[PDB]
Amino acid sequence: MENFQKVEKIGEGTYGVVYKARNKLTGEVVALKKIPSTAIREISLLKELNHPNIVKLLDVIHTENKLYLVFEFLHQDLKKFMDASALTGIPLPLIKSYLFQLLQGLAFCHSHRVLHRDLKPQNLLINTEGAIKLADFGLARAVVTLWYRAPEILLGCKYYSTAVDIWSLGCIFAEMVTRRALFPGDSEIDQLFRIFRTLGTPDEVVWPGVTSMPDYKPSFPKWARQDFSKVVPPLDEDGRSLLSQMLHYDPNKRISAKAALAHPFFQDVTKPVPHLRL
Ligand SMILES: O=C(Cc1ccc(OCCN2CCCC2)cc1)Nc1cc(C2CC2)[nH]n1
């Protein structure tokens, strides 16, 4: 750590403090996260999971029982960008470009059997060139917001799949379009009931095996499903169809990142430049 000069506090992550810092030898500006042997090995495997839509893990430093993760630095996160764009809304071609790029990043990690598990706007990082990148990939395996949590996790599935990331990204896509969180739960039951109130209480018809899940209760209220036309106006039919497939209850029916990239919604995808004031 004597090789780094702290510049400013980026924020407080799930694991520890994140600083913007300067590497004293290379002159490199990085993000430094201050955090068992199985953790060392899993984190070391993440150093090889390189993709243009994944924030680069430059180095892993284990000293005096403290673990430091050195990452590529980006100037802005999507949460702050969405707040800054609240009055006008993020233009649809930019939303579409960001969703396309995030799906490319997920398709890559998922092809390597690596899940994010905790996607949220705060860990999606953006630059002046129009890129968007996933941060904290694979750290979950190695107040916390529930808004993006998949229903199978809320229902107590211990062995969840890559579909949990598609659910989180669908929630984020809806929030970029409407300028409001889709399911802003403030407890696990409030989160689950908000999902049920919009998508309908799940049953054996739409989700075989749901009633056998660890935290499923037959006493859950039974709410009717709402039309996506009410949920995400003014999104077009291609976007609503894609979002519906990213929000399927059954993780097995939920669209994969690779199949989502082929969706007609992306026929006219482009890579616009965001308006960024740094
Ligand atoms: O999280 C960001 C975006 C960012 C940048 C600078 C910020 O400044 C923070 C507070 N300052 C105090 C005075 C004014 C504002 C805040 C957020 N970037 C990251 C993260 C990572 C790796 C995953 C670890 N890489 N890049």
Indicate the domain borders of the chain.
Answer: 1-75, 76-276
**DSSP string covering 168-210:** HHHHHHHHHHHSS-S---SSHHHHHHHHHHHH----TTTSTTG
Question: How was this model experimentally determined?
Answer: X-ray
> How far, in Å, CA of 43 to CA of 195, rounded?
33
CATH topology for 76-276 is Transferase(Phosphotransferase); domain 1 (1.10.510)
Instruction: Tell me which long-range contacts 187-194 makes (C-beta under 8 A, separation of at least 24).
Output: 187/146, 188/146, 188/154, 191/146, 191/147, 191/149, 191/154, 192/151, 192/154, 192/155, 192/220, 193/220, 193/221
Read off the DSSP letter of residue 74: -
Phi/psi class of residue 209: alpha, beta or left (left: φ > 0; alpha: ψ in -120 to 50)?
A: left
- Which atom number of ligand 1 is nearest to the Cα of residue 77? 3
Q: Is 94 in the pocket of ligand 1 (CB under 6 A)?
A: no
C-alpha distances out from residue 255 to 58, 79, 130, 246, Å? 32, 25, 25, 6
Does the beta carbon of 19 sit less than 6 angstroms from any atom of ligand 1?
no
Amino acid, res. 62: H
- Alpha carbon 229 to chain centroid, angstroms: 24
Sheet holding 132-134, edge to edge: 76-77, 124-126, 132-134
Q: Which of 83, 118, 165, 236 is catalytic?
A: 118
Is residue 14 marked as binding?
yes
- Determine whether 186 is an active site residue: no
Please give the C-alpha separations between residue 9 and each of 13, 16, 32, 149, in angstroms, as whole numbers: 11, 11, 10, 27
Nearest CA among 70, 64, 84, 278 for reference residue 176: 84
Task: For residue 45, give the H/E element and its range.
Answer: helix 37-46
Number of C-alpha atoms within 13 angstroms, CB side, residue 36? 5
Structure resolution in Å?
Answer: 1.6
Residue 18 Cα to ligand 1 midpoint, Å, equals 8
Exposed / middle / buried, residue 151 (Cβ in 10 Å: 0-12, 13-18, 19+): buried
Asked whether 139 and 93 are in contact (CB, 8 A), the reply is: no
Closest-lying ligand 1 atom to the alpha carbon of residue 123: 23
Are 127 and 74 in contact by the 8 Å Cβ rule? The answer is yes
* Other beta carbons less than 10 A from residue 223's beta carbon: 14
CB of 249 closer than 8 Å to CB of 199: yes
**At residue 265, what are phi and psi to the nearest 5 degrees?**
-55, -30
- The C-alpha atoms of residue 147 and residue 71 are separated, in whole angstroms, by 26
Which CATH number describes the domain made up of 1-75? 3.30.200.20
- Count each helix (H run) and each strand (E run) in the chain, helices first: 9, 8
Say how far residue 70 (Cα) sits from the centre of its chain. 20
Distance CA 230, CA 198 (A): 10
- Determine the Cα–Cα distance for residues 276 and 211; give it in Å rounded to an integer: 47
Phi, psi of 210 (to 5 degrees): -55, -40
- CA 277 to ligand 1 centroid distance, Å: 14
Residue whose CA is closest, atom 6 of ligand 1?
10
8 lines ligand 1 (CB under 6 A): yes
Which of 122, 101, 89, 132 has its CA nearest to residue 233? 89
The number of angstroms, rounded, from the C-alpha of 57 to the middle of its chain's C-alpha atoms is: 17
Q: Are strands 29-34 and 66-72 parallel, antiparallel or unpaired?
A: antiparallel
Q: Which residues contact 25 (CB under 8 A, 6 or more apart)?
A: 3
Tokens 């049953």 identify what position?
Answer: 203
Q: One-letter amino acid identity for 103?
A: L
> 201 CA to middle of ligand 1, Å?
39
